[PDB]
Symmetry: C6
Subunit: 219 residues, 6 copies
Amino acid sequence: PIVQNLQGQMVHQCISPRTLNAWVKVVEEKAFSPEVIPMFSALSCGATPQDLNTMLNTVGGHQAAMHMLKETIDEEAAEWDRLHPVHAGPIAPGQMREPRGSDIAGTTSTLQEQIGWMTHNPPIPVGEIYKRWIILGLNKIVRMYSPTSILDIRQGPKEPFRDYVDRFYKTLRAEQASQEVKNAATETLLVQNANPDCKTILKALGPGATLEEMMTACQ
Amino acid sequence: PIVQNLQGQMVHQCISPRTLNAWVKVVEEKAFSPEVIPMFSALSCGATPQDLNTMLNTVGGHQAAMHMLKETIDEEAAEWDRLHPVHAGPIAPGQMREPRGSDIAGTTSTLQEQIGWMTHNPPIPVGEIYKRWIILGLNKIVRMYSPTSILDIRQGPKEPFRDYVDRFYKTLRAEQASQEVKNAATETLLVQNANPDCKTILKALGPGATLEEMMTACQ
Amino acid sequence: PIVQNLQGQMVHQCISPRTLNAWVKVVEEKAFSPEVIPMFSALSCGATPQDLNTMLNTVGGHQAAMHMLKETIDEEAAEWDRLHPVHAGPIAPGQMREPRGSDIAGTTSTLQEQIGWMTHNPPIPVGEIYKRWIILGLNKIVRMYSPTSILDIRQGPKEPFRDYVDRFYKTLRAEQASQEVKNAATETLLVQNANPDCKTILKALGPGATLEEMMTACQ
Amino acid sequence: PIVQNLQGQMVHQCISPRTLNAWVKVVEEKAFSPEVIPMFSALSCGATPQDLNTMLNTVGGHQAAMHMLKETIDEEAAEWDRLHPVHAGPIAPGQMREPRGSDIAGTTSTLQEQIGWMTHNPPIPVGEIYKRWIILGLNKIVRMYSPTSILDIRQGPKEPFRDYVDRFYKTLRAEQASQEVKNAATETLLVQNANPDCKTILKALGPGATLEEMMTACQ
Amino acid sequence: PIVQNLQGQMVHQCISPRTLNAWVKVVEEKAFSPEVIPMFSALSCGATPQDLNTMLNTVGGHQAAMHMLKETIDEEAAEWDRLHPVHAGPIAPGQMREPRGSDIAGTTSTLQEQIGWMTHNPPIPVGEIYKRWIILGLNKIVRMYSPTSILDIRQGPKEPFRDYVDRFYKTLRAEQASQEVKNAATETLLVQNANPDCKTILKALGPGATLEEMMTACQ
Amino acid sequence: PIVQNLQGQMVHQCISPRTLNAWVKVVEEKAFSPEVIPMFSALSCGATPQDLNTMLNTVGGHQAAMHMLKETIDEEAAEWDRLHPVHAGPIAPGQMREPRGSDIAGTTSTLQEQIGWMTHNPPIPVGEIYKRWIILGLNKIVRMYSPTSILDIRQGPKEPFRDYVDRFYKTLRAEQASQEVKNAATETLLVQNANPDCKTILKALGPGATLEEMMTACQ
Ligand SMILES: [Cl-]
Ligand SMILES: [Cl-]
Ligand SMILES: [Cl-]
Ligand SMILES: [Cl-]
Ligand SMILES: [Cl-]
Ligand SMILES: [Cl-]
Ligand SMILES: [Cl-]
Ligand SMILES: [Cl-]
Ligand SMILES: [Cl-]
Ligand SMILES: [Cl-]
Ligand SMILES: [Cl-]
Ligand SMILES: [Cl-]
Ligand SMILES: [Cl-]
Ligand SMILES: [Cl-]
Ligand SMILES: [Cl-]
Ligand SMILES: [Cl-]
Ligand SMILES: [Cl-]
Ligand SMILES: [Cl-]
Ligand SMILES: [Cl-]
Ligand SMILES: [Cl-]
Ligand SMILES: [Cl-]
Ligand SMILES: [Cl-]
Ligand SMILES: [Cl-]
Ligand SMILES: [Cl-]
Ligand SMILES: [Cl-]
Ligand SMILES: [Cl-]
Ligand SMILES: [Cl-]
Ligand SMILES: [Cl-]
Ligand SMILES: [Cl-]
Ligand SMILES: [Cl-]
């Protein structure tokens, strides 16, 4: 990654074996669960496009998802080239060439060029731009591999309300619905999909009840 | 986190894989036991709002609690906006804009802005302010998930007084009662809920006896 | 902890996940064995009062001992206030306020104030003062939880003298007797509690024999 | 490796025990799977030719592949000598001698000479040149040890399309075919080798369908 | 330990949790085998007397040996006081007081005083002096706990000569005999204690044969 | 080891617990396999003679080999003294005394003297000179403990050619034959010791075939 050393200058460091192993293990253990994406974003803190390609390519298996990830990366790279056409001309002695879509993806750019963009003033954060493309493609993989729909998450007649809400927002997180549909899930599906005994209690609670108040009422 | 390097300047460092893994493991092993909160506060030492959101979002499962945590965060963010209304106007070339409630929660603020507030002179510690909101919501989760009331912790007729006091303050810690009710628990419930043999000995001890004196007397 | 960086200035560092995990594990594995106290003192090297409270509060269970530890801390804090009454008045622009007993315990003082005392010239080592209070309370827990008295440690008729001396000083260490009673344990109880065959040999050795000479004679 | 320290100067560091152990373990666990090559490239970040020879020589077993790796290294070293014949003459007091093919492979060059080339201005990156030779030979080992041909990867009549695509691109990755043959694998073999039910659905999808659209259609 | 930082000045660092755990584990696993002593010397590199007492006191059990270690430390401390009687008088503003025997053992000296002696110019290496006393006492424990004498290590009639020499020098190492008795062990006891078949071959080899030549001859 | 810090000056660092443990473990797991020697050379990067003696002495067991290692060290030390007789005379205030053979082995030299030679200008690399002696003795141990001769490595009638070549160069590596005998092993013994079916195919391949071509032909 490109990290600021203990002197105030942005320099390159090699990706650590701890970072490499941590990313491989979480994919082996959790696959494409929703919480893997924030783990990927944190383990790739300050990562160059080369570091991002390293983390992706060190993953063995799940190649169906890894190839869906490449298509999303190519789609975003093509959109970047449509919005940022590179202007031909010799690069000034102290400047950097404009990055193409494949340059941000680390496939047509060298590490020195990636360091040059990320450490420029003002900097071109090709690592963070590439990471946005990767996380976008990873989120589509999480939704595709989500097995259960939120409509099928219903509380059992003897299931504790706490365990049911655990399954509810676990499923809703993988579905990655819109903000409007997710915010009202507390007042709509969570009450509708509860068992008759708890739904009766939640009805007498009235609208605008917090999740803490709803879980307390059905305990 | 924002850490002072070995030169006296506050700079940003990426959250370490050791920190990321340590927080995920303690939640997998201890869930929301009371001692998880001081572990979260220590692992998030100097953490930015982005680091705090990272630690929370890397947690898979327990989504009922994680969503109760979001509501507490939104409640505190709304209270911050009520007490600190942002004043409109162009930001001076060397100053920072006033953070909104969602800016402290890391949802509407960039890392550069969070670094700008935390490294300002005087600094706006949005990371520590956000951590106060998170710990507040985490403490409410510990109380809700506390299974046993302190009134039901009674010493068995053959249970050693040491094991009974272990269960007593373990339950009392999760209940997180007031300081007045918790301080007098030594002289009130701890003696009342003891078995007849030890309660007789603790009665002859008289008021004002230390826990060391009470445990010694019933050994 | 407050550590001297690689430039000669005392600055604050966050407590490491390795330090946090090491202290939690040794309590889970060894509880309050005598050797846990030097491990606590080493793991808390240069620790601030906040770091000390962190290590104590991350311990789940053993709450009977942890509450006995709080009473010892409060007793020492009250003794500190009796010997150091804070003088009222505005603090000079470059000075620090006098710490109260609860300030050294980290309950009424901020981290910045603890850094201010520990890095002062001359420094007020509130971390080492607090650690003395904690170790004092921890030593009382080791004695209370010591199951066997030194008077009951006797060598078996067929027990090797080496194993008996292992049990002897293991028990004596947890008892934490006075220096006078512990120094003469070599010449008094260790010989008296040996089996008849080894006691006969140790009698012919004469007074002033080293433990190496006594163990060799009964081999 | 040759790493830039926290002062802006390229200096040598010893290869860490974490790096040494991580490379030995991944070979013990994954042998010559395709994802081992990006792991080798990352673990050898900034590595000198001596570090590269160290990582290769610490591998016990797989000596058939390790000897095939030596022949590829010798072939590339001979090609380097054909394109870069060293010019005889005394080296200037501040310059470096031209590296031979065996000098880049670390067999006829000292560490000081490798540091001299890598830290030169302009630098001769003998470590990255050697790594290109090693990765080239490692890729030939991956293809040779690939057990299954892509033509034999066909979807079962009841096999889910997701698992079939997992096996498809896993096999195709080890085959390491040309870019033209690999890019069209989505529109050609992946549909041809699917079961009759999914092939019918993929036919009605039409050409130019993304892998995300194809996997969704056969779910 | 007192380590030279990355600026050329000798400063104090806290003993690491890795060092603390490594010393406790090797004692739990190997007890007082001969190879534990060089491990103790390496783990205590640059250690202060406080660090040395920390490592010794973190050891639970083996208290018979740990108390024999204290007597050896007191014997050496008394010998130091006999050779270095402290001269009374006020210490100059830039000097250090002469260390007593108990000051080197870390029992009557503070860490600041130990840092003052070790970082003095010229330095008083109280840590290395104390370590010599500890290693001296540890070596006496290794000899006492050595179960087998070198005279009883004889090669079996069917035992391979390699395994017999393994047992020979393993026993001889724990005995820690004199240099004269240990150097000639190759030409004396190693041949005398071999089986009749190998002793016949070693006799025809003649004097002055290396261990490599002796092991080859009896293979 | 003597490592260049982050300021361009060669200073001493204590050998890390990770380095100490890594060397002990690889000897416990792999003994004296050929790949242990490059692991020893890497773990001892920049090691002083004291660090080298530390790594050797921390090895418990295998004392037959460890004593054969001492004789090789003494042989090389005697050869060093024969080629470098120390010249008597007082050492200049800024110079270092000439190292004897036992000084390079770390037995008659202090750490300060070893630092003085290694950090001299020009430096006397006593650590690398000692390491050459150790690796020389370690290689003789690998050959002695090699159980199988290369002449006895023959391909089974149903053994895959890949597994046979694995056993071939594994045995040849431990034998550590000459370069001339090892280079022609591809064209001589590897074909001669193959089964009749593969030997027939390798005969029709003709001379000068690469190992990749030979393994492909017998697959
Ligand atoms: Cl690492
Ligand atoms: Cl995987
Ligand atoms: Cl994310
Ligand atoms: Cl450019
Ligand atoms: Cl609940
Ligand atoms: Cl880490
Ligand atoms: Cl979890
Ligand atoms: Cl807390
Ligand atoms: Cl701003
Ligand atoms: Cl008790
Ligand atoms: Cl850590
Ligand atoms: Cl515990
Ligand atoms: Cl202590
Ligand atoms: Cl103040
Ligand atoms: Cl004994
Ligand atoms: Cl390491
Ligand atoms: Cl292997
Ligand atoms: Cl690669
Ligand atoms: Cl040169
Ligand atoms: Cl799917
Ligand atoms: Cl550590
Ligand atoms: Cl132990
Ligand atoms: Cl030693
Ligand atoms: Cl003094
Ligand atoms: Cl042998
Ligand atoms: Cl370490
Ligand atoms: Cl071993
Ligand atoms: Cl080597
Ligand atoms: Cl000298
Ligand atoms: Cl093959």
